């Protein structure tokens, strides 16, 4: 299950590289 941030969008995020994809997916997990 994915969840995006309330100011992320998925086409746009799944544009920028994984390790940014990563990183940014590592946060939204310390945060939920």
């Given at each position: 299950?994915?969840?995006?941030?309330?100011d992320i969008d998925p086409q746009v995020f799944y544009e920028l590289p994984e390790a940014v994809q990563k990183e940014l997916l590592a946060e939204w997990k310390r945060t939920g």
């Open positions: 299950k994915i969840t995006f941030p309330s």
